[PDB]
Structure formats: C-alpha cells, structure tokens
Design an enzyme around this catalytic site. Structure first.
Site, PDB file in Angstrom:
ATOM      1  N   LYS A  59     -12.612 -14.208  10.403  1.00 12.52           N
ATOM      2  CA  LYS A  59     -11.073 -14.038  10.850  1.00 12.52           C
ATOM      3  C   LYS A  59     -10.545 -15.389  11.139  1.00 12.52           C
ATOM      4  O   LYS A  59      -9.834 -16.012  10.353  1.00 12.52           O
ATOM      5  CB  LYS A  59     -11.064 -13.199  11.869  1.00 12.52           C
ATOM      6  CG  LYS A  59      -9.518 -12.855  12.481  1.00 12.52           C
ATOM      7  CD  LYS A  59      -8.575 -12.393  11.086  1.00 12.52           C
ATOM      8  CE  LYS A  59      -9.110 -11.202  10.466  1.00 12.52           C
ATOM      9  NZ  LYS A  59      -8.367 -10.741   9.183  1.00 12.52           N
ATOM     10  N   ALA A 147      -8.876   2.676  -8.671  1.00 15.01           N
ATOM     11  CA  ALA A 147      -9.025   2.239  -7.290  1.00 15.01           C
ATOM     12  C   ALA A 147     -10.344   2.732  -6.805  1.00 15.01           C
ATOM     13  O   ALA A 147     -11.460   2.184  -7.515  1.00 15.01           O
ATOM     14  CB  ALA A 147      -7.926   3.010  -6.402  1.00 15.01           C
ATOM     15  N   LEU A 149     -11.664   5.252  -7.390  1.00 18.62           N
ATOM     16  CA  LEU A 149     -11.985   6.162  -8.402  1.00 18.62           C
ATOM     17  C   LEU A 149     -12.602   5.439  -9.569  1.00 18.62           C
ATOM     18  O   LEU A 149     -12.384   4.284  -9.648  1.00 18.62           O
ATOM     19  CB  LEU A 149     -10.678   6.868  -8.827  1.00 18.62           C
ATOM     20  CG  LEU A 149     -10.083   7.610  -7.746  1.00 18.62           C
ATOM     21  CD1 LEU A 149      -8.723   8.137  -8.238  1.00 18.62           C
ATOM     22  CD2 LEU A 149     -10.870   8.721  -7.279  1.00 18.62           C
ATOM     23  N   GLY A 204       6.401   1.888   5.372  1.00 17.61           N
ATOM     24  CA  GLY A 204       5.649   0.761   4.560  1.00 17.61           C
ATOM     25  C   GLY A 204       4.872   1.426   3.469  1.00 17.61           C
ATOM     26  O   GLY A 204       3.784   0.890   3.049  1.00 17.61           O
ATOM     27  N   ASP A 218       4.146  -1.396 -12.331  1.00 12.53           N
ATOM     28  CA  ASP A 218       2.740  -1.142 -12.111  1.00 12.53           C
ATOM     29  C   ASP A 218       2.367  -0.113 -12.797  1.00 12.53           C
ATOM     30  O   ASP A 218       1.120  -0.156 -13.463  1.00 12.53           O
ATOM     31  CB  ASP A 218       2.823  -0.628 -10.549  1.00 12.53           C
ATOM     32  CG  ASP A 218       1.515  -0.563  -9.772  1.00 12.53           C
ATOM     33  OD1 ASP A 218       1.121   0.364  -9.099  1.00 12.53           O
ATOM     34  OD2 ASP A 218       0.606  -1.177 -10.255  1.00 12.53           O
ATOM     35  N   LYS A 222      -0.673  -0.199 -15.411  1.00 10.86           N
ATOM     36  CA  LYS A 222      -2.125   0.876 -15.535  1.00 10.86           C
ATOM     37  C   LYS A 222      -2.344   1.386 -16.789  1.00 10.86           C
ATOM     38  O   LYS A 222      -3.279   1.608 -17.202  1.00 10.86           O
ATOM     39  CB  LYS A 222      -1.810   1.428 -14.165  1.00 10.86           C
ATOM     40  CG  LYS A 222      -2.169   0.858 -12.827  1.00 10.86           C
ATOM     41  CD  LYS A 222      -2.055   1.779 -11.711  1.00 10.86           C
ATOM     42  CE  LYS A 222      -1.872   1.143 -10.347  1.00 10.86           C
ATOM     43  NZ  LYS A 222      -1.247   1.897  -9.403  1.00 10.86           N
ATOM     44  N   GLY A 339      -4.995   2.211  -0.643  1.00 13.81           N
ATOM     45  CA  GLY A 339      -5.815   1.950   0.483  1.00 13.81           C
ATOM     46  C   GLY A 339      -6.688   1.051   0.716  1.00 13.81           C
ATOM     47  O   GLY A 339      -7.355   0.485  -0.203  1.00 13.81           O
TER      48      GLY A 339
HETATM   49  C1  LIG Z   1       2.453   0.556  -2.939  1.00 13.95           C
HETATM   50  C2  LIG Z   1       2.132   0.287  -4.659  1.00 13.95           C
HETATM   51  C3  LIG Z   1       2.876  -0.865  -5.040  1.00 13.95           C
HETATM   52  C4  LIG Z   1       1.068   0.185  -4.747  1.00 13.95           C
HETATM   53  C5  LIG Z   1       0.163  -0.800  -4.380  1.00 13.95           C
HETATM   54  C6  LIG Z   1      -1.212  -1.049  -4.633  1.00 13.95           C
HETATM   55  S1  LIG Z   1      -2.151  -2.268  -4.024  1.00 13.95           S
HETATM   56  C7  LIG Z   1      -1.529  -3.470  -4.590  1.00 13.95           C
HETATM   57  C8  LIG Z   1      -0.827  -4.507  -3.630  1.00 13.95           C
HETATM   58  C9  LIG Z   1      -0.029  -5.607  -4.422  1.00 13.95           C
HETATM   59  C10 LIG Z   1      -0.078  -5.769  -5.803  1.00 13.95           C
HETATM   60  O1  LIG Z   1       0.425  -6.905  -6.097  1.00 13.95           O
HETATM   61  C11 LIG Z   1      -0.874  -5.037  -6.522  1.00 13.95           C
HETATM   62  C12 LIG Z   1      -1.133  -5.266  -7.935  1.00 13.95           C
HETATM   63  C13 LIG Z   1      -2.470  -5.348  -8.297  1.00 13.95           C
HETATM   64  C14 LIG Z   1      -0.425  -3.926  -8.738  1.00 13.95           C
HETATM   65  C15 LIG Z   1      -1.539  -3.844  -5.855  1.00 13.95           C
HETATM   66  C16 LIG Z   1      -1.929  -0.128  -5.416  1.00 13.95           C
HETATM   67  C17 LIG Z   1      -1.276   0.939  -6.187  1.00 13.95           C
HETATM   68  C18 LIG Z   1       0.182   1.185  -5.586  1.00 13.95           C
HETATM   69  O2  LIG Z   1       0.720   2.211  -6.059  1.00 13.95           O
END
Ligand SMILES: CC(C)c1cc(Sc2ccc(O)c(C(C)C)c2)ccc1O
Ligand SMILES: CC(C)c1cc(Sc2ccc(O)c(C(C)C)c2)ccc1O
EC number: 1.1.1.3
Lengths: 358, 358
Positions: A59, A147, A149, A204, A218, A222, A339
């Site tokens: 930290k 993830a 998974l 959030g 996103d 994927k 998570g």
């Molecule tokens: C909340 C949403 C945006 C999300 C976040 C994450 S974690 C996460 C947070 C910021 C970021 O730039 C990324 C990239 C790798 C896609 C993943 C994983 C699945 C997911 O659906």
C-alpha cells in the site's frame, strides 16, 4: 525442478490490488518473486532482481517509495537480462501497454493480462502473439473473458483435441446484464431505461461514464477474442454488428452527468420494444454471439424465453454457451464475470498455468 | 523447450478408442510419442522407445499382434528406462491397474486417465499420488468428473490462488442425469421410472445391468473426489449417505432381466415423489453434495424448483455448482458428462497439460 521464476506487476487499481494480495498469501510449491511493482509513477523496482521488501504491505510501501516508474521501451530491456524465468501481469486496460505486447514476448517475457486491447485490437497482432516460435514468451488472458471463469482455458483445449466450435451465445457484460436483468423481467414492469442505467451508475455498476459500457465496445471485444479462438477470422471489434445503447444524438452530450438527464429523452423506443417483447412472451438481454459456420459475429439485444436459463441470472453474472461438434447439447458456463477477487484470481490462476510451463 | 514427451496408453475399449484416434490426428506444437499400446493381452510396446510407426487403423495393428502385455509390476520397472519423462494414459477402470498408480508416481511416471478408481480408494493411496514429491509423477484425471467439463482443474486452480470451496453441488452421473431428465420434467409428464430405465438400457445408456448404475456408486465416487479436492477428509465412496435407486427387494434377484421386469413394482414409490413435486413447481434429480463447512458429503434424491437451472437439463448433461468464498454467487458449469469423444478429449487435453510440464 524450476521453482525459481521472477514476476513483474504493472498496475494495482482493483483487480491489480487483489492480484497482489493473493499472489503473496498464495502458499504454493513453486516460488514467485515480485521483482518490480510499477503503478503510475511511484514504482517498486528491484535492481538487485530478487524478491522485494514490501510483503503484504505494498500500500504505502509503493506510495512512499521515492522511485519513479520505468519507461516501457526500457522495461522490456531491463528484463531481457533477468535471473530466472520472468512474468508480466498487466493489471491495466491501457492499449498503450498492450500495444507493446509484441516486444515483451519477442523478448521471452511472459504475460497474463485481463486487458483485451491486444487480443481484440489488430488481427495480425494476434497471428504472432500466438505463433509457434519457442523463443518468445507466454500469453494468458483467461480473465479477459471468463474472468475468474475458464472460458479461454477450456476452448483452446477442446480445440487441439480436435473439436470444432459452431456457436457461442452469451452474456459477456456485467453492467449490461445487471441493467437488462432489471429493465426487462418476467414479472413485467415498465421501468424506464433511463432510470435503470441511472441507478446502475449510482451503485457504481457502470464505468464512471456509462457510455464506455453502453456502446457494446467491451462485449464486442470479448466476442472477437472468443470468436477468433473459435476459428473465425474477425478483423476487428467493429467488423460486425454491435448494437450500441447510446442515443445516436447523445454521444458527446457535454459531461457524463450531462448525459444521464439527457438520455431520458429516448426511452420511448426500448420500452416500446420491451412491451412488444411481452406480447411474444419474451424478456430482453444483451448478448454476444458467434456462429462459426456462417462466420457471423454480432452483439446486441436478443429476447429470450422465460424457461431459458439466461432469463434467470442473478446479480451481474456472465453466462456463455458453447455448442460444438461433440457438445451438440451446448455447454453452459455461468458465474461472476466481474469482481476484484474473482477477476484477479483468474489472473493469478493464469500466472500459475505459466510457471508450471517455464 | 520441452516438446519431447513419451506416452503409454493402456486400454482401448471406447473412450480409449477415441482417445487414440484423437491423440494422433491432434496437430499440436508439442510432440507426443506413443511408446506403447497395451490392450488386454495383445500389446504394441516399443523397446527402443521410438514411436509406433503405424498411422491410422491402429486397431488392426494392436489386435493382430504378438508382443504379450508386460505386467504392471514389470512395466513401471521398464518405462523408467525412458529417455524423456513418461506419461500414463489408463483408458480403463479396474481396481487393479488403478492400485498401481502411486507405484508409477513414486518412480517418476506421470498419469493421465478417466479412471475414477485410484482417486476413490482411501485417504491414504490418495495422498501418495498428490504428495508433490520432487521426481514424482503427475496425476491428472479431469475425465473422472463431468468428463470433458473443466471441473478438477478449475478447482485445483481457484484454490491454488486462494479460494475456499464452501459448497460443491451437482448432478454427476450420465445415465442418472439422462434418466431423471426424462422422468422428472417441467411439464408434469407421465413416464414410469422403470420405463425410462429400460429405455435407458435399450439404447445402451446404462450398463448391461442397470443396477450397477442405480446404486449411486458412480456418483458417490465422483463426489468423493470433488469433496476431497474441496478439502473434506472423506475416507471412502461409502463413508457417507448414498441413496441407492435400487429397491431393497430387487437387490437380491440374479437375473438382470428379473430385476427390470420387477422394477415396475416400485414405480409408485418414486412416482408419488414426482407428484409431490406439485410442491410449488419442482422436478426430481439425483445429486452429489459436499458442504466443506460441516464436512458433510451425501448423494441422493434432491427436489429442485422449476425455475432452477437443474430442472432444465437436456440429454445426459452433468451440471455442478461451486459456491466459494470469492464466488458467493456459485459458479455453475454444465455440459456433456459422458461421451466417447467428449471424454477422451478431457484425457487428451490432460496428457497435454502434462507434456508442457515435463
Ligand atoms: C463494468 C464493466 C465495464 C466491466 C468491467 C470489468 S473490469 C474492467 C475495468 C476497466 C477496463 O478498462 C476493463 C477492460 C479490460 C475491458 C475491464 C469487467 C467486465 C465488465 O463488464
Ligand atoms: C471410471 C468408471 C466410473 C467408468 C466410467 C465409464 S464412462 C461413464 C461416465 C459417467 C457415467 O455416469 C457413466 C454411467 C453410464 C455408468 C459412465 C465407463 C465405465 C467405468 O467403469
């Protein structure tokens, strides 16, 4: 045996924070030496190139540390000359770092990132990071999709054995699932899309700016990765239909807070689409889809039947189906797709799958 | 790198037959040399450890042979002479061959098998296998639970990262799965238990004597393995409650046929239970269950709600849930828990996970 392997960790936001917490408290047979922890500017390099002096207290250890972060073009260099086998755990999302995934690996360096960019960006930047040149390093990204998974972990394998994928239908987004799971239910409600996405940002569940989630980006990325693995030649995360949920007009609407109170003017569609869905006895879900056969990828809103498992997902779980040659009856894997711990663990687990190979 | 690894294959009935067909046609980066194929008596050993120049239709090469299968007490005392590390692919299930594994590991032999035996004897023979002994051999058995599905691995993983399986639960038997998926359905069906049972027998889904499947034995064994991995000290596959689906009376009859011709006399017992499923909306399923906390394992009939995924399994799929510390929301993995290709692939995939380590 080879129980001596040095590791470099870049990024410690969240999944990076959990990744470290676990990497150490991780009692194992092999030995993992964190030779460097470089966050933003304040870093914790180890010239000596031997386990650091931070323990389960990185930290402030990294905070205090009067060390400024090493330049990437110089980092790949620092490592070319390292004790025993080395690893990289890019806990970031930056495309700037992945943009240099060629150098790292071309220089033996190993990696285990949850960052898509490289795996969803270029198509020739994939036909290399996975070549059969034994001189370069390993790249594991199980946390990029599954993830915590084992989606990539499982597909790769089933593939070499000789199975051939055909279709992949799934919920690859935590945010969009939560949002849709709440907006469209079997109980039938008339909640507006605006309010849901709003509430979702309040807790959030979305990015600071929901847009980064609503544009299918996103998911599109994927799917591209999975689709590629599956055997389809997808040029980019935009080389197919991806149904954005960001009102054609509102994509630049001042600030993000200036987008919420503005988005409210376009629910008349999805609702009408939600109600109409009701007539057919259907719920609304945002899914990814890859149909190997017709080389047709696509991400968007698909309406499922109540009996269907998808129409029964709790929290923000990612569910993915894999109908193959041998698995005529699709294999359905569902669990936490997001998570801190859950995700880091997929990464830590990855690093392990590497160490055993080096 | 290490792309040189020799493999020994014992058994070639069915999953053994597919395992070979795949092992060769399996184009990969690494190199797998089948140094010996020993079925029944007719074997195909390779004294000079050089591969088995044969190709396809190896089935006629093994049948039409002269070299007698070298004993198991004399094989481990031979293979050692191997130049490269060794692997053992036991595509069989005899509490004999099994009871020889440790005798392979302790000597440096690796094992990849679908056999649920050695991994179900007693908490002693087990420890002997996964004792992380330096020159010991590798012990992999993913095809031992849920077949191709990623159960073991995904478990040895999240835990190796720092996860504490809290409650493992699922449907581990192919036949039983099939049977119930047909006997207890969403829509109040009307199939007599023994009817979907003979129907099972007729299509070869069940063993020649359906009883060997209704005794819970198989499941009881699978749970034991999972439970052990999970962290519970289970002495044997019989050290806990396992509800035999075989009537008490019918256990005695000799004729595999008199059992079946009489199983109809106990249909109501199980038929009322399915009616009692009017309870709100439930279906009947035979499940495995491991509750780490209370160290309580058990296999038997559990009644699930319609909405529940289990109450929606097609064919003969195995579904298993894993509720852990980090995965408060249980991870549900479901897919083909049986099958020639499906199963062998889990084995072939295993062998691969070994080669990369040797
Ligand atoms: C909340 C949403 C945006 C999300 C976040 C994450 S974690 C996460 C947070 C910021 C970021 O730039 C990324 C990239 C790798 C896609 C993943 C994983 C699945 C997911 O659906
Ligand atoms: C390893 C052992 C348990 C075994 C497995 C198989 S294959 C196998 C796997 C799962 C399953 O539910 C069933 C039923 C039909 C008995 C068979 C065949 C013979 C056999 O002796």
């Amino acid at each position: 045996s080879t129980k001596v392997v040095n590791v470099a960790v870049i990024g410690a936001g969240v999944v990076g924070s959990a990744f470290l917490d676990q990497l150490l408290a991780m009692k194992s047979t092999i030995t993992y030496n964190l030779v460097l922890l470089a966050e933003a500017e304040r870093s914790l390099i180890s010239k000596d190139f031997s386990p650091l002096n931070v323990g389960s207290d990185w930290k402030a250890a990294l905070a205090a540390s009067t060390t400024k972060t090493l330049p990437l073009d110089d980092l790949i260099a620092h490592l070319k000359t390292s004790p025993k086998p080395v690893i990289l755990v890019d806990n970031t999302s930056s495309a700037y770092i992945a943009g240099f995934y060629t150098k790292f690996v071309e220089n033996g360096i190993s990696i285990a990132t949850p960052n898509k960019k490289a795996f969803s960006s270029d198509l020739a930047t994939w036909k290399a990071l996975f070549s059969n040149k034994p001189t370069n390093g390993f790249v594991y990204h199980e946390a990029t999709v599954g993830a915590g998974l084992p989606i990539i972990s499982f597909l790769r394998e089933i593939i070499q054995t000789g199975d051939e994928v055909e279709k992949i239908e799934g919920i690859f987004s935590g945010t969009l699932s939560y949002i849709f799971n709440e907006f469209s239910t079997s109980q039938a409600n008339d909640v507006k899309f605006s309010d849901v996405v709003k509430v979702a940002k309040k807790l959030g569940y979305t990015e600071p700016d929901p847009r980064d989630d609503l544009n299918g980006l996103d998911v599109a990325r994927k799917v591209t990765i999975v689709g590629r693995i599956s055997g389809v030649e997808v040029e980019s995360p935009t080389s197919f239909p991806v149904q954005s949920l960001i009102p054609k007009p509102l994509e630049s609407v001042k600030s993000a807070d200036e987008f919420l109170e503005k988005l409210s003017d376009y629910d008349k569609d999805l609702t009408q689409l939600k109600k109409e869905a009701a007539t057919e006895n259907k719920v609304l879900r945002f899914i990814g889809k890859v149909d190997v056969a017709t080389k047709s990828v696509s991400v968007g809103i698909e309406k499922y039947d109540y009996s269907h498992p998808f129409a029964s997902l709790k929290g923000s779980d990612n569910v993915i189906s894999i109908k193959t040659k041998r698995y005529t009856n699709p294999v359905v894997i569902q669990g936490a797709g997001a998570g801190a711990a859950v995700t880091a663990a997929g990464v830590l687990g990855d690093v392990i799958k590497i160490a055993q190979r080096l």
